[PDB]
Design a protein around this nucleic acid. Structure first.
Lengths: 338, 44, 137, 82, 211
RNA sequence: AAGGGGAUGUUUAGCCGGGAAAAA
RNA sequence: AUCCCAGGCUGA
RNA sequence: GCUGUGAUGUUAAGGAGCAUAGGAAAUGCUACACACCUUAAUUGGUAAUGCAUUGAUAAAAAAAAAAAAAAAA
RNA sequence: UUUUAUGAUCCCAGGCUGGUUUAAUAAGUCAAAGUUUAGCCGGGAAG
RNA sequence: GAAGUUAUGGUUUGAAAAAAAAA
RNA sequence: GGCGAGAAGGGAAGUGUGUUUCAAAGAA
């Protein structure tokens, strides 16, 4: 037993150092004015609600199941209701520390993934078990796809409570490697945890292209133009906006507006953002794009089109985050149909 | 025992999707069975 | 240290011995499993002996009766009178209390679960229930 | 709490999408005779629904269970591998 | 006499099928159920591709001949598909330009639904078409089945009937299967840089076509 | 018309997934 | 097991 | 060249007509509405629906100029 | 050991629910139980 | 999805299983 | 190729059907 993971801590406890230390001392863990505490904070210096308490381990190495039960019960009793306490071994401690690091440095990783040249090289893997990290994803890809990828360009999607999501984005070194990963990783059985020297639990992973990234100065305020925007790519290099309007009309695509996207280098393919009047029109156009893909025989995982959506923004001055703002009414832009 | 694997994203996105009727159910179990997806064999 | 996995050959031998496709009453299966001493060997590898009481408690808590349709025989015998739990029908009635008769795969799953739970009872970090919700404040 | 999808399942589609399908094998009430009485003139009255992959088979026949059904549901079966 | 669906048949290039003893999955308890895979046999409909089109052809050996095997390539303009057109063309039609008309489709002329209200009204009265140039060809069942790829672009039709003028007004896609190759009315044009060796000019007609 | 009407001319191989028939 | 797949990936 | 073969097993849990039993238990429509399905769209469609006949088993069939209101003193 | 005169064991027959006005000092909800557009529900099979 | 929900008529003809023993 | 399609069911079920009182979150 290396430590404890405390989740869903209240903001008061997370922010007040003295309160947390006093709670741990009452529970039994001696926190120096020994056990060590590490909070999960983002680049904005805001606690995510997760804490890691590493027990003193020149002596706790002799702890047993009864000691674990007693300490966990005391911690659960002391800590506020609604916050969960879990026991973490050395592997869990490593995973937690890596998760905190990636949470802090997510923005830079997202920008690096969004470098326009990597448009066709990012692969999305889901559902990745929580115990997995970048090294585990690399090993899994090597084993089940015979593809080697950098273990430093793997990005985990995070949740509002600071816990890692079940989605990974991996930057394959080549489009061939990305296609190989897509073809190989489909319903692949994967161990969930290593315990007692065996592999426990099976999760069936899949790969696809469901999260495309683009970081550029020409698109920062593009999404704000309209809520119904469809990105498309894979067209010939030299086609301009008017020529593409004519081509779309010929193909029976009826966008309200067209905006060409060009980046330094890579003129072999032209990318366009289409804008529509209604979410219904956007969805029907996406359905027709799927039909045209199938009739054109291009790769089912080939990057052809997608639905534009600005990533959630969080600013230092904000008191209520836009993603966490319960007053949002954007759903009125998407009428429901059966 | 388990159901065919499907993403949680699809689970969430099918929230308002009306389930098939009698004839639409009958159309899913015909023998030509052209609608079956990848890793979605009923028997296997 | 480690938790070795039991051999299908040994488990099949125990299952057939208890029996003597094939379903064997949980009573016979538990008695044979306790006689074989396999759980004791697992515990020694990983203090007292496992009890029939402990096996019954683990069976109940795992709730395999509900998971493996252990109550379908109630509806086969009583019929519609088997739907309501005891007391649902104020007239009264008889509800069979027969514990489930496990097949080989069900018995194997139960044995694996029992071994894992017994290991967790002592391991400093368990496989199951490693997270406990805080109640105080 | 009740389930959002009920007795139907989300499953991948031949066109790259997803759709809802009823469970397999069918949930049948075998305690009653087939209706109409002439159902045998057009159907196989002893049709069976197997679950076999390669050489491994599973014997699973859904049947009603005692209440309360709860989240699990009315139907269940045994674990029988061949 | 009554008009009923023709018997189901298997396509050319496949083994036989055993069939089923009743029409559909509900027969006869739900008489108004229609299967999605039902054959379209009524006038004004196009039979499904590779399912009910191209049935196995059998004739008594008395009437068999070599012309019997050119039926798919001799299918008329309204029915002949892109692959059947391409099979008997120079380089299997590759390097040339193809475009479909659609003005003679069977549904637009025949059937009970041919004349119906349209969102714009009835017809009272140069064109930018879609041009496909094959580059990769492979026939799975000659001449009517093939796996083709090529360049799709926006052309420019004109007054001769119509004639393609600028097959590359706008660049489209450089490698895609032909659109609507399953059936329809296709027209083709050889490339500008054509060779007389491949695209053989018509042999001169006899001066005196004696009987 | 001595001599091109000549010469060269075996089938790509695996894995996964889905469908049909026979069998079950 | 090789009939079909406008379904895919691979071979230094 | 000469019989034949190629998925070639098609009609009730419904409807209608005619009879049986019973004191008795049922008939016509070109149907500009609503609702629903579809669509890019008051884009297209319906017979669920809506109308009429009989039935004798229910109503209305009195009172106010400029109003459509007014316990009509 | 479990049910059982609070009806066990064990036959035959029946889906349940709502509908405004409503005379009499009988009403402020039609007053133990009487309905009429409707509400909820009512297996599976081309092997 | 859960928790509670008086039975009626045909006049009805009170104990029913399990277990033990038996061969 | 895509959506919709039960002649709008009374064929099962008595401690059942239904009723009354409640409850049901994704973006974790």
């Amino acid at each position: 037993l290396e430590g404890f993971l405390l989740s869903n801590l209240p903001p008061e406890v997370t922010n007040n150092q003295q309160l947390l230390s006093s709670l741990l001392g009452r529970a039994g863990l001696p926190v120096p004015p020994s056990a060590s505490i590490l909070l999960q904070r983002s680049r904005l210096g805001r606690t995510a609600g997760r804490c890691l308490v590493l027990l003193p381990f020149p002596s706790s190495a002799f702890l047993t199941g009864e000691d674990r039960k007693a300490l966990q019960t005391r911690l659960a009793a002391v800590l506020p209701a609604g916050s969960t306490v879990t026991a973490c071994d050395r592997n869990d401690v490593e995973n937690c520390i890596e998760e905190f690091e990636r949470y802090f440095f997510l923005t830079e990783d997202l920008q690096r993934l969004g470098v326009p040249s990597n448009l066709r090289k990012v692969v999305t893997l889901s559902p990745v078990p929580p115990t997995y990290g970048r090294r585990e994803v690399r090993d899994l890809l090597r084993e089940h796809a015979n593809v080697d990828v950098d273990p430093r360009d793997i990005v985990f999607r995070f949740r509002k409570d600071g816990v890692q999501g079940d989605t990974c984005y991996v930057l394959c070194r080549s489009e061939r490697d990305a296609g190989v990963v897509l073809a190989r990783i489909q319903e692949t059985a994967v161990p969930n945890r290593v315990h007692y020297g065996q592999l426990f639990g099976c999760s069936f992973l899949w790969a696809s292209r469901s999260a495309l990234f683009l970081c550029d100065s020409q698109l920062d305020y593009l999404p704000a133009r309209s809520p119904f925007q469809v990105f498309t790519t894979g067209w010939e290099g030299d086609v301009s906006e008017e020529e593409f309007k004519n081509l779309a009309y010929q193909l029976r695509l009826f966008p309200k507006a067209v905006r060409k996207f060009s980046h330094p280098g890579g003129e072999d393919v032209s990318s366009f953002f289409l804008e529509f009047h209604r979410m219904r029109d956007a969805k029907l156009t996406m359905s027709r794009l799927q039909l045209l893909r199938r009739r054109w025989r291009i790769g089912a995982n080939t990057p052809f089109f997608g639905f534009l959506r600005m990533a959630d923004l969080r600013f230092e001055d904000d008191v209520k985050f836009a993603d966490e703002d319960s007053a949002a009414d954007s759903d009125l832009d998407e009428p429901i149909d059966y | 025992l388990p159901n065919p694997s499907v993403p949680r994203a699809a689970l969430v996105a099918a929230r308002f999707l009306r389930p098939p009727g009698r004839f639409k159910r009958a159309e899913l179990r015909e023998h030509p069975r052209s609608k079956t997806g990848a890793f979605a064999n009923l028997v296997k | 240290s480690s938790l070795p996995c039991l051999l299908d050959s040994e488990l099949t031998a125990i299952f057939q011995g208890a029996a003597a496709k094939i379903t064997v009453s949980s009573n016979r299966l538990f008695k044979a499993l306790l006689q074989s001493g396999i759980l004791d060997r697992d515990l020694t590898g990983s203090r007292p002996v496992v009890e029939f009481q402990k096996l019954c408690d683990l069976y109940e808590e795992g709730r395999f009766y509900r998971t493996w349709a252990g109550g379908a025989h109630i509806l086969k015998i009583s019929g519609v009178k088997g739907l309501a739990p005891p007391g649902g029908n104020l007239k009264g009635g008889i509800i069979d209390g027969t514990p489930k008769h496990m097949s080989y795969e069900e018995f194997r799953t139960f044995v694996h679960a029992v071994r894992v739970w017994l290991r967790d009872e002592r391991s400093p970090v368990p496989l199951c229930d490693a997270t406990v919700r805080a109640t105080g404040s | 709490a009740p389930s959002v999808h009920g007795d139907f399942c989300v499953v991948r589609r031949a066109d790259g999408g997803f759709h809802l399908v009823p469970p397999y094998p069918p949930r049948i009430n075998r305690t009653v005779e087939p209706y109409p009485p002439s159902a045998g003139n057009f159907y196989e009255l002893n049709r069976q629904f197997k679950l076999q992959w390669k050489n491994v088979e599973y014997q699973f026949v859904p049947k009603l269970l005692p209440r309360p059904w709860g989240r699990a549901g009315p139907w269940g079966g045994d674990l029988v591998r061949i | 006499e009554k008009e009923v669906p023709p018997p189901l048949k298997s396509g050319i290039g496949e083994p036989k099928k055993t069939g089923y003893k009743f029409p559909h999955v509900f027969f006869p308890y739900k008489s108004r159920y229609r299967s999605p895979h039902r054959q379209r046999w009524w006038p004004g409909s196009a039979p499904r591709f590779l399912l009910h089109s191209h049935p196995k052809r059998w004739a008594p050996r008395r009437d068999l001949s070599f012309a019997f095997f050119a039926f798919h390539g001799l299918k008329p303009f309204a029915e002949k598909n892109l692959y059947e057109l391409m099979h008997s063309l120079p380089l299997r039609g590759a390097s040339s330009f193809f475009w479909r008309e659609a003005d003679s489709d069977p549904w637009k002329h025949l059937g009970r639904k041919a004349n119906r209200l349209q969102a714009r009204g009835v017809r009272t009265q140069g064109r930018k078409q879609l041009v496909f140039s094959p580059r990769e060809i492979y026939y799975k069942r000659r001449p009517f089945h093939a796996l083709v790829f090529g360049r799709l672009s926006v052309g420019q039709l004109g007054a001769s009937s119509r004639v393609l003028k600028h097959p590359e007004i706008i660049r489209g896609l450089s490698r895609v299967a032909p659109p609507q190759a399953s059936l329809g009315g296709w027209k083709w044009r050889p490339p500008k840089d054509a060779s007389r060796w491949i695209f053989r000019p018509k042999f001169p007609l006899p001066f005196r076509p004696e009987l």
